[PDB]
Amino acid sequence: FNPVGVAFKGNNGKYLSRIHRSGIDYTEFAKDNTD
């Protein structure tokens, strides 16, 4: 039993820092591909 606890409570990710813009010049989301 634990109704008070859902999921959002108690959850940590990591050091969010790697890509910004200088190290990337693509457009996968901006422009989709055909097939």
Percent of residues in β-strands = under 5%
How many helices? 0
Count of distinct strands: 0
Give the biggest beta sheet.
none
Can you give the helix content as a percent range?
under 10%
Structural class call reads little secondary structure
Tell me the span between the first and last alpha carbons.
Answer: 50 Å
User: What general outline do the C-alpha atoms trace?
Assistant: elongated
Rg, alpha carbons: 19 Å
PDB class: unknown function
Keywords: cysteine-rich, unknown function
Assembly: monomeric
Entry title: Structure of Hact-3
Structural features, described:
The chain is low in regular secondary structure and 35 residues long. The protein is elongated. The PDB classes it as unknown function. Keywords: cysteine-rich, unknown function. It forms a monomeric assembly.
